[PDB]
Structure prediction request, 818 residues.
Amino acid sequence: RFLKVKNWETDVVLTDTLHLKSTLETGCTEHICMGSIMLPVRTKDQLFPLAKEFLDQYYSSIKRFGSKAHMDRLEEVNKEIESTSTYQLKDTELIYGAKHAWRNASRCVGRIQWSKLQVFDARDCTTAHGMFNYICNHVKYATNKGNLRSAITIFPQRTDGKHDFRVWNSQLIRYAGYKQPDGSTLGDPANVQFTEICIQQGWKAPRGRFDVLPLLLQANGNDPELFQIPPELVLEVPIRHPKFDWFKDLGLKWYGLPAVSNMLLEIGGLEFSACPFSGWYMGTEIGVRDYCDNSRYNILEEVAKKMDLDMRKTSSLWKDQALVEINIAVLYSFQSDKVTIVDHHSATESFIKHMENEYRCRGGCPADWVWIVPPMSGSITPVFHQEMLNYRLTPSFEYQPDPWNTHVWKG
Amino acid sequence: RFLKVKNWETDVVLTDTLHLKSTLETGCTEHICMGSIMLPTKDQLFPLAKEFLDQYYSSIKRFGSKAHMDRLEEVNKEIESTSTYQLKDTELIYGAKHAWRNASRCVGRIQWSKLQVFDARDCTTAHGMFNYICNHVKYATNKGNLRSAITIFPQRTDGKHDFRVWNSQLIRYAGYKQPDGSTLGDPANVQFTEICIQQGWKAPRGRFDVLPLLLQANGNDPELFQIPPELVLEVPIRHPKFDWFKDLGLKWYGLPAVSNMLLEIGGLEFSACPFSGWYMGTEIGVRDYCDNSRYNILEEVAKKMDLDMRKTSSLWKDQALVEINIAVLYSFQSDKVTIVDHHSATESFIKHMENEYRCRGGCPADWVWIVPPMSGSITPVFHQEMLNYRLTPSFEYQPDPWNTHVW
Ligand code: HEM
Ligand code: HEM
Ligand SMILES: CNCCc1cccc(OCc2ccc3ccc(N)nc3c2)c1
Ligand SMILES: CNCCc1cccc(OCc2ccc3ccc(N)nc3c2)c1
Ligand SMILES: C[C@H](O)[C@H](O)[C@H]1CNc2nc(N)[nH]c(=O)c2N1
Ligand SMILES: C[C@H](O)[C@H](O)[C@H]1CNc2nc(N)[nH]c(=O)c2N1
Ligand SMILES: [Zn+2]
Prediction:
């Protein structure tokens, strides 16, 4: 079966065959589309075809499908599974898997970069102190003095689900959020619940507006431990505006390195529950979502006031005007400090090129329109007019429940 | 089988049961989502009618009544006899309002029950259609105090006697391909602006020439009519601050009147059902003006603002996009023509969505279309999970008549 997607702006039509290699469920049916729903212990039974499917993929990619190397590897994995109930990936396979999980991430607009991923193998890690060391090294490597480099560090895979490695932080670097008795929030409201746990776990909170949260690290199913990232490793950028001098006095800054640390990496049926990865920011992530979401720092108004906008009627678009100036300031600040960032026009333009290349070289590119379109100025980016097909390929990044909701406490 | 949708800004959770009454197909499967794809007999008819009469009689608290059962037999008898059937006015109005209510892509559905339905099923000719369309336009326009309206022409019989309005909208600006290479007027209508000529129109080859109507009655060849200019309410576009904005020489019409959709009620097909409401500002300023394959004046506005158009990172496009949209809203509000901003309209829609979940058990919604084309995440709908499914009565797309007309 063939599927065609049309760019309504260029009339370019593409043909998808890759969706045939799709296994996992979308959430949708003939009768309902769940395309806007945010988030819609394995027996040897279902493990071998998963491993085999992965190894067939891997060996096809290295032009060795059906080789003796391929066949012996299937045999070895087969024997390891029935003997030990799981298996170990070679380094080559692990790197391939991690890159392809990113390549397959249908909500990621930054996928043009997928083949340049530095993969750090942390599978020999046994303790939280070990995890901290690996993560420090990741951050130092990734940050690279502002010249950001994509990287992923992969901790040991799940076994029985009782000895999981988990990074409890949703991102390696994030600001604390504190709920005040009067109902207001100090810092990042997105992090209030996590900040609380940290505090309960013995973190002494500075209680400022931009306190970098400690790492809360769980090795081998043991209770998580607190670690402070060395501040010299946390690259931060003071936000200023190129025309508005009062903007700096808002006292804003943001960290340079977006490093998502709560997702699960699935490769050949193996589950890596702690696999922090990082790239670099698209400006709107900070300027639109992190500062302007009503459920975040929500500074739209204070910016709007300082611009002396007509804030009486929404039809003055004061919210839209403030939003743009803030995003201008984020991009200005990062570029001025030589910290890698990409604006949404550049990023979506790149993604379109990537996508067309993928259709050609791969037979498709799974893409979630809902996430790919930037949170501002959607229709003046080329992705907006781009029809996209969403389907799930493995290897993949998956969500997993927050660890504090599932963790069995030792003491 | 009972579905929950979360709003991520408010944690408000809604439970949908209404999707269970869905009948048509989405284009999606368990293995692939097509959420971002724009366009995915005597025996067929009676269950379709039954289904409709069932919901109709339920809506008036007379499900399981003599009248219900009697109407059911009558329609059934009329079907087996005539191979189709006629709706009663009450049912027709009900069906039209519910087609709007069920339009998952429409952010303006909070207004769904205030729809003026104009029964034009007695119409036989293009001149007749023209008369009805002029009356619709005058009524809907209301000197700027816009009112929602639909005019419904005779239902399809056998696909040979189709009533069709060939325009995509009752009011749209001409577009001509220059010898220069680019495009004069509206690029979206170049192919239509041509068919008008190829049928006999005489373009003032201008930039904002109101297109003539091309009206097809009873399957016959379509005929050109000029909408009386005095019925076409237009708004000169100025900015409340950029005095140079006027010189760009832009205007737009007040009445968005979509005329190429097919209205399906109780199995019956109304191929000609032009309907109109009023604009959300972003439809004109974001899409009509700033789309690359439309008026595409972003660059020109940016220059007059003397923004740094050297690198995309200055966000000059975004900056200009906003000013343009401020001007549109300002221009309509000034001239006392109904318009709604995307903030108001999405806020209205969340409320409508709440109401529908309460009083109906759900509200089919297409996030891809509901979220406005600018500033999406600072509107409440961006953080709103939505379920998309097809309920009937409904508006459907239909092929362009020229591709299909048996001349
Ligand atoms: C290198 C530059 C990168 C850019 C500019 C970028 C950009 C983005 C953006 C803007 C999103 C949407 C996030 C949101 O709005 O919350 C996203 C999602 C995502 N990205 Fe990328 N990304 C980059 C690198 C990476 C890397 C290195 C990985 C993994 C190795 C990755 C994997 C993902 C995944 C799995 C999602 C979906 C998250 C979810 O489903 O919640 N990205 N990306
Ligand atoms: C009264 C004020 C109204 C507002 C503010 C409004 C708003 C909108 C907007 C912004 C869209 C997306 C259009 C686009 O971006 O191209 C839309 C779509 C739609 N509207 Fe409404 N609308 C209104 C009235 C109506 C009425 C009166 C009807 C029918 C009785 C209707 C039926 C539809 C349908 C069927 C679509 C989907 C069109 C498609 O699938 O291509 N709307 N609406
Ligand atoms: C603001 N939307 C957050 C919703 C959400 C929920 C769970 C995970 C999640 O990850 C977003 C995400 C993931 C990977 C990224 C990689 C690079 C980058 N610049 N942003 C990235 C952003 C995002
Ligand atoms: C710019 N998108 C155009 C795609 C498209 C194709 C076919 C029909 C169509 O209708 C949009 C539409 C329908 C009804 C409307 C009612 C009111 C309003 N302000 N806009 C409305 C807009 C829209
Ligand atoms: C490819 C994509 O489906 C297409 O550009 C859609 C996206 N969302 C839209 N949303 C609205 N409201 N109107 C549109 O015309 C479109 N076009
Ligand atoms: C309900 C909806 O799916 C949710 O708000 C999504 C919308 N699109 C998004 N798109 C991106 N890139 N990031 C997001 O967090 C979201 N949130
Ligand atoms: Zn879907």
